Amino acid sequence: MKLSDLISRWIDVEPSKNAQIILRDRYFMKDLDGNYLETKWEDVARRVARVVATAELLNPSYKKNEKLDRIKEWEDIFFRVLKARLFIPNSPTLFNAGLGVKHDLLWKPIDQMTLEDYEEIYRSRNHLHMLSACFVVPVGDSIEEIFEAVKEYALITKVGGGVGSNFSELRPKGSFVAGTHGKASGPVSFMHVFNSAISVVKQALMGILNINHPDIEEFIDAKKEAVLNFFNLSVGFPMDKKEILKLYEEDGELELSHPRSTIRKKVKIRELFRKIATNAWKSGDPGLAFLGEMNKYYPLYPHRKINSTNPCGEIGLSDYEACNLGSIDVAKFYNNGFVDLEALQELVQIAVRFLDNVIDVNVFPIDKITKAVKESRRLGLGIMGFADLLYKLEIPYNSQEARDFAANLMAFIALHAHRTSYELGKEKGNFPLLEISRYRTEDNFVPFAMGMSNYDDEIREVMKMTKEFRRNVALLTIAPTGSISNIADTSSGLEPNFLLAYTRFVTKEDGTKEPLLYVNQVLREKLNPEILKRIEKELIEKGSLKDIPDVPEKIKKVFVVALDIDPMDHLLMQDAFQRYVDNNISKTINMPQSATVDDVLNVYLEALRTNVRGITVRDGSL
Amino acid sequence: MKLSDLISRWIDVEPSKNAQIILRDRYFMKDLDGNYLETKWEDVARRVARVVATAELLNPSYKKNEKLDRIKEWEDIFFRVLKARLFIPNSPTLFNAGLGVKHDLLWKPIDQMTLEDYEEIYRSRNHLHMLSACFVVPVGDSIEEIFEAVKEYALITKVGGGVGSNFSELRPKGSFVAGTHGKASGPVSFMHVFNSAISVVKALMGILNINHPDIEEFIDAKKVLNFFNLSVGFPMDKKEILKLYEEDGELELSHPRSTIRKKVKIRELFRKIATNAWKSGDPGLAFLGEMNKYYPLYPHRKINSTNPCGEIGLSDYEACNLGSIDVAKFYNNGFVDLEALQELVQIAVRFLDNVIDVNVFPIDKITKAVKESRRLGLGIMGFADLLYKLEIPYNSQEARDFAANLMAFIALHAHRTSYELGKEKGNFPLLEISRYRTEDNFVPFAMGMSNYDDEIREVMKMTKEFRRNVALLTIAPTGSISNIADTSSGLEPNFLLAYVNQVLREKLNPEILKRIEKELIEKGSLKDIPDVPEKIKKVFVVALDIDPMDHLLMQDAFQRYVDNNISKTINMPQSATVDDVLNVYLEALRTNVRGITVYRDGS
């Protein structure tokens, strides 16, 4: 099916009442007075499409005699895909597109648009026109660098970004400070300042400490009993995952040390791991960040180095680098028992361009970030709706079938994303740092592990072609998609549905407040409406269909939720996707309440054997 | 008595055992390995004197063929007064003089010193060579400016400065922020960030004006601002505010970047301040309008905050270095030796003004605001022990008349020295646009309690032409430096005679001393000890023998002849009431004080 046809099937389907609340709540633009400028998703799509299409002003392949034609064509395709809700960029794009721009230009009919109208939009983008979700800043070992970074956290947060740092540069607690004949506080104590800062710019953050830092144990325990309430915390592994797994298997020891300290200590790695697993088993923190694995696949490594992820972990970033995201709802690409690969390829094409255009209309609060992004042009195209896609295809999430499907789907998207990046480098110019990247200086560099798809050889072929032309350093991620999957009425990221049914309460102004039942749409349409009526009550009490009487087996096996899927099946699904993502992946390893700390440990060990770049894990713990 | 004679009398008097501990703990310089480079007070005086003398390198009145002998003469007079402990600069000067400089140059004998040795000292001052106690930075109404200011607090704190801000520029809690769907957190929430920053580098001053919509929240703030001293700012004239109170008027709380407006009864605001001050000692009162009344550079420049202790009101990014003369050492046969004193005032101003030229700050804007103004804070310590020696009770009109004359005299000669230094070295950059220039009978304090007034006016007129410094005077708390100098703190009464006071040892037999010693350490006074001569009781008063108004009136007598402000605690008995506090405030608004601190015993 052509994309245009699929667009027609969805373009007049309106967001559900649930989505509309979220849109009214945070997305619809308002004036200084608090009046709505936007009252319909369509108005958001109009504005966003117009602003991002405006980047086509910069397109060197266009003749002035042609420019307004082209810009208008991109505006309409971007508009049509956003309105149909087939692709949605990360929230900051939808919040901030067109801030600074006269309200007369953002929503007026495209037929009325002039070249000078598009140029005025370009011109009038204010310092709040920040369209990217993901940021990393360094935090260097000095009072001056720490507080410059606290300021940067504040500035980035103001404009709607999420920021992470590796704090390992900071000398351990108790170490010698020259200026003071005193003693250093250490990273964990400086992270409270970043926490206090942000908790006031918000009337989540990423903090990483490397496994060999002398304060690592303190770090691991930092969120137990949480002073760092705005931080997600991951333990950083800058060495190879193989070395770490080997050291564990031999019951080896790790030396904790720091260059600007005389503080040295030997710890049993098994013991470090158990402490991390015990804390993660209790509270969910800290996760694991396989920084070495990220650098394995970083085209610019070792010239440039990935030290931290953004707050949700899906983008590994070098210092001052940012990254903009967007997601395709692949549940909408289901057609009679197959995924419509024809319409999907056309959309991957459009999406890569939309995302790459976001960089040109993006305004960042810090010059070093502007420069880092211009230089690399890193994107994060991903998917949402994948669980609902498996439901439609009648595939159990917790099956080798699902993971095989997932790796092929991702491999196909990867293929056509990187092909589009090739085409864009040819059309608009390569990312400045192409020449010094492994796409150039190597033969056979691929930014992911592959090994689970028929498309591998074709992918290799595209990667070789991008030695010449390449618009972007990296193109892909799977994000959490909390809100944008809500807007799109679909399941989040690559995550299974957490629940098939819950009560979402609607506030009658006025009246009082209504108990409104949600049942998963795909469940509603496959399950016999009279079975639904019966079990509906038990499903809400129990959270699964598995021990409900008189629901056919095939419905129980297909309509699995997060907690029906055991930890390894979660882990292996992450692996399947990561093999064909050049950035990282947002995946919660959900674990049953009855899981032990050893069960967590075993996930970590398995994690070290698979291709995952990071780990997040237990029901009932928080 | 010549100053050289008075120097001879104290120069070989050794710091006490108490003082020596303090010196060893934090003043004696140490190397990277923790070994002492200095083992006695004289080593400190040597180093500090040499470094500050180095500023005479910059003196355009000296030929090069003269500079060496000149510098050496200054090093020597500086060394002698410091060693004698007759004048001691603020602590940062003691801690930080000579940082960055080869250890063979700092204690080497003065006769071996060459012009190149001095030039090397000058050149090798490092980024930590910060010698000033008092700082103010703005905190403007944007995320950018707030977090730059948090950065500045950290940087200033690192090098040993104390910093204050007026937070009033920050739009009130709940106000509209363009950037977001969120509302503004308010000055007070933001003050917690400053407090967190400092809690990791470590004391601070936070002011919020009386007409800020968040003022009541500010007043209640310390009822996790553990590092803040808090003062309510009064940018309006003290007259208007006292008038409004007396008329039971209302104040309009508003902010330019908020729609949040509210009316409160000023009397109710004051009662709420007094209630909290009554409980915990905070917040104090900062009469900003009154500081600006005597600010030579107002209104082109403006004083919005003080340093953490209140004694210097500072414009944005301005800093100020302090030094104190121990006036107890100037007692001679029933009189203050004004002859030696005038010589020291002369030397002290030069020392303090030289400190600017060898000072290094961590923020260019501070460097610039200090070069432009050259504000000094010359004060006194030892005052209370002076009153002991002179047999004057602190809580008497005699004491306050004494204090005003003494302060008047010091003012006279400091400002006369400022004029001389302007002629010698060049005027402060901003003289032309100051009220010393653009006005006729501008005087930077109220006066009205000394026969030196006409002479003071005459010197102020002279400083239309030549003037090295925008302002010269303060009374600081002098906690540590008065400990070093074995004397009483600032203008404060002694808090306690025994925990024994040396002037009390030298005056009471003993026998009566041996006997009463423990009763005086329980009761904390001589007041209700019988068999102590009435003359001894009257003179040897402590902080809490002196009622609140006598404290306040002593502050007023000094402030009349101080161009900056004054650090003074209004001590109150434990049985004082919230109405007793309010009465102190109302009296404060009628006197010439520029700020208020109260402390009720037992709080």
Ligand SMILES: Cc1cn([C@H]2C[C@H](O)[C@@H](COP(=O)(O)OP(=O)(O)OP(=O)(O)O)O2)c(=O)[nH]c1=O
């Ligand atoms: C000054 C100071 C630094 N530090 C920490 C902050 C950084 O993690 C680290 C270095 O701070 P810096 O600001 O770099 O200290 P410095 O340059 O004076 O000393 P050094 O030559 O040893 O760098 O020490 C504290 O924890 N507390 C302090 O009071």
Ligand SMILES: Cc1cn([C@H]2C[C@H](O)[C@@H](COP(=O)(O)OP(=O)(O)OP(=O)(O)O)O2)c(=O)[nH]c1=O
């Ligand atoms: C005001 C407000 C904003 N948001 C916004 C802030 C974020 O920009 C947005 C997240 O929406 P998504 O774009 O779905 O972000 P994500 O969950 O995919 O994660 P990533 O940050 O890695 O892209 O949610 C809330 O969740 N709740 C709120 O109350």
Ligand SMILES: Cc1cn([C@H]2C[C@H](O)[C@@H](COP(=O)(O)OP(=O)(O)OP(=O)(O)O)O2)c(=O)[nH]c1=O
């Ligand atoms: C952004 C933001 C600002 N503020 C406060 C900080 C300052 O007191 C004040 C100004 O912040 P600003 O950073 O100036 O916000 P803006 O300039 O983009 O928009 P506006 O001019 O309308 O503010 O708002 C918050 O309290 N929380 C916030 O998240």
Ligand SMILES: Cc1cn([C@H]2C[C@H](O)[C@@H](COP(=O)(O)OP(=O)(O)OP(=O)(O)O)O2)c(=O)[nH]c1=O
């Ligand atoms: C009284 C007293 C002061 N101090 C310290 C705190 C400071 O580090 C040190 C400063 O030297 P000071 O002589 O205290 O400076 P000051 O008190 O005049 O205050 P400022 O100049 O800021 O207006 O005094 C103690 O450590 N213990 C004490 O008992």
Ligand SMILES: [Mg+2]
């Ligand atoms: Mg350093």
Ligand SMILES: [Mg+2]
């Ligand atoms: Mg602003």
